[PDB]
């Protein structure tokens, strides 16, 4: 079918913090969420046949994320996501990330696009990326931790085209993310 969907919120998340992911085209679309809490859901259309989807669990526990193309589930859907309770000491909203390799584009043929990640005002947590292009090919991003809570990371496009980078701290998608290039 015409529908791809990936990202942090199909695996994990934290309570009362939006579990997020991406859905791409390749009829009319739909989602539903069986879980221990009333989840609230929204697909923010980016314009480009892809849309930011976020739901809001209010209970620790496991939730089943059905994405549905027509009449019936996406390929791997339902996805099954274990939502963790918000640690007292984790601030994803307070993570910042930036640089040439997160723009519009300018990102050229085969060539490195830089970018950093400042997690210092962000408490304790596991960092995890999610990157696929405009065809659901995975994107490799070596991430080199400097030590001080900041991170050198880069990748190499091949295309005058769009690559999508999702960023999770403590399994929670980060502000300004998912970045589209």
């Amino acid at each position: 079918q015409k529908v791809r969907a990936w990202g942090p919120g199909l695996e994990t998340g934290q309570v009362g913090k939006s579990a997020d992911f991406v859905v791409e085209a390749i009829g009319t679309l739909g989602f539903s969420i069986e879980g221990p809490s009333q989840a609230k859901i929204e697909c923010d259309d980016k314009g480009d046949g892809s849309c930011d989807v976020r739901y809001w669990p209010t209970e620790p526990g496991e939730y089943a994320v059905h994405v549905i193309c027509d009449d019936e589930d996406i390929r791997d859907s339902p996805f099954i996501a274990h939502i963790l309770p918000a640690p007292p000491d984790c601030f994803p909203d307070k993570v910042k990330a930036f640089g040439p390799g997160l723009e519009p584009t300018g990102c050229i043929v085969d060539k490195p696009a830089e970018f950093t990640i400042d997690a210092r005002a962000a408490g304790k947590g596991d960092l995890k990326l999610y990157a696929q292009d405009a065809d659901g090919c995975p994107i490799d991003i070596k991430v080199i931790p400097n030590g001080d809570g900041t991170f050198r990371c880069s990748y190499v496009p091949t295309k005058p085209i769009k690559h999508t980078i999702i960023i999770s701290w403590g399994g929670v998608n980060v502000p300004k993310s998912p970045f589209r290039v």
């Binding site: 679309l29 739909g30 989602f31 539903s32 879980g35 221990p36 859901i41 929204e42 697909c43």
Partner: peptide, 9 residues
């Protein structure tokens, strides 16, 4: 309690 929420377009 089990709950189911859902959206379509």
């Amino acid at each position: 309690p089990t709950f189911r929420s859902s959206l379509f377009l």
